[PDB]
């Protein structure tokens, strides 16, 4: 069987630029290689087959090349519709393995997160629960980390996090983090803190309240 090594895993790019994605097979696969594009929330779609041939109706800015163990997909003057993920796949023998993927992301200016913290609602407390929520909004680049503290002590348990995809209007990222406690635990403590660490703030942006 054949292992495929795809590179890069991710790249930030701008419309108009030229991008090259690479796949490397563990043995000679004699041009039995396809490339697919996969847009967010959509099924993959064939771009290139037999290493070098454009599928029916695929834009000419896409090109495939290679032979032996080394294959490339090139996008010449990238357009808005080209952001998403790309995968190679071989058909040399069973199993027909895919490369691990390349995600293309839109470049924009760096932006510090806007951090907001929210105490539990009266409603939730009446039901006996206590969720504290922290939004870390409209930041760039993508990587970020949040730390919770209760009365100055770091809290790891009971934390749920979620992240948006790149924003359709401003190309930033956002994150939501929820710390969930029992109402009894919540009411024993005094201060609640959310700390955001980002490229723009390696010393964290800190938001707190007193219950």
């Amino acid at each position: 069987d054949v292992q495929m090594t795809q590179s890069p895993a991710s790249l930030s790019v701008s419309v108009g630029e030229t991008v090259t994605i690479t796949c490397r097979a563990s043995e000679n696969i004699y041009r039995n290689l396809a490339w697919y594009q996969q847009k967010q929330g959509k099924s993959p779609q064939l771009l290139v087959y037999a290493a070098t041939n454009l599928a029916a109706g695929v834009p000419s800015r896409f090109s495939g090349s290679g032979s032996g163990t080394q294959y490339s997909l090139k996008i010449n003057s990238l357009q808005s519709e080209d952001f998403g993920s790309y995968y190679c796949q071989h058909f040399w023998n069973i199993p027909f393995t895919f490369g691990s993927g390349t995600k293309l992301e839109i470049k924009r200016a760096d932006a510090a997160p806007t951090v907001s913290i929210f105490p539990p609602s009266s409603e939730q407390l009446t039901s006996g629960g206590a969720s504290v929520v922290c939004f870390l909004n409209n930041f760039y680049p993508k990587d970020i980390n949040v730390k919770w503290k209760i009365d100055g002590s770091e809290r790891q348990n009971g934390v749920l996090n979620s992240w948006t995809d790149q924003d359709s209007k401003d190309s930033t990222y956002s994150m939501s983090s929820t710390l969930t406690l029992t109402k009894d635990e919540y009411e024993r403590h005094n201060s609640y803190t959310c700390e955001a660490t980002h490229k723009t703030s390696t010393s964290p942006i800190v938001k707190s309240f007193n219950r």
Partner: protein
């Protein structure tokens, strides 16, 4: 005109088995291999196996040899993948795809079936308003939120002011933990807007046929 029809979603219990379907149209069903592909959330594509309808000859990724059983009904032009002994690691999107001998690759794909393996029963969400800390709005803007907790299955549809307020919104992907979903949404407006004007979160959960409004009130 070539189409592969898959169910959009299936919820199934752990330890149970599920039969996923792929109904082909627009070509002679026995002419092409049907392949199956797994994709875990935010991860890559993984090839499971294939079948040649008619003789029903098959190939498998060794990793799926017991997990997946591939069959086909030529009288209904439908390929089937049985997934047995279900666990949380089976929760994924499963695509069927047609192989073309000319292209030497997959030329048409189904929409994918989102398989959720869970013990949960259908459950309406609790919706909580998130008002800012009673600190102070000397900032030029203000961020409000809505917390949607404890529902099953997906999806929910969340709007702000019945959809009147669409700019400055971040609605986060749901997270399944301890076998219920939670999601959240933030909305950011200028400080002159709130609390002078009403802002309400509206949350529809079609599986339980519920719709719930929560007005965000100052603390």
């Amino acid at each position: 005109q070539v189409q592969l029809q898959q169910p959009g979603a299936e919820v199934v219990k752990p330890g149970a088995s599920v039969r996923l379907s792929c109904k082909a149209s627009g070509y002679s069903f026995t002419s092409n291999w049907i392949n199956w592909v797994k994709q875990r959330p935010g991860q890559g594509l993984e090839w499971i196996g294939n079948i040649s309808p008619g003789g029903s000859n098959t190939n498998h990724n060794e990793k799926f040899k017991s997990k997946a059983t591939l069959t086909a009904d030529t009288s209904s032009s439908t390929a089937y993948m049985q997934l047995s002994s279900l666990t949380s690691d089976d929760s994924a999107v499963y695509y069927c795809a047609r192989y073309d001998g000319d292209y030497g690759s997959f030329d048409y794909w189904g929409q994918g079936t989102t398989l959720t393996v869970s013990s949960a029963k259908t459950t309406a969400p609790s919706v909580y308003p998130l008002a800012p800390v009673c600190g102070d709005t000397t900032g030029s803007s203000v961020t409000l939120g809505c917390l949607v907790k404890g529902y099953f299955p997906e999806p929910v549809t969340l709007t702000w002011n019945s959809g009147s307020l669409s700019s400055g919104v971040h609605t986060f992907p749901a997270v399944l933990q301890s076998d219920l979903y939670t999601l959240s949404s933030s909305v950011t407006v200028t400080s002159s807007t709130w609390p002078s004007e009403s802002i309400t979160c509206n949350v529809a959960h079609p599986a339980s046929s519920t719709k719930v409004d929560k007005k965000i009130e100052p603390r």
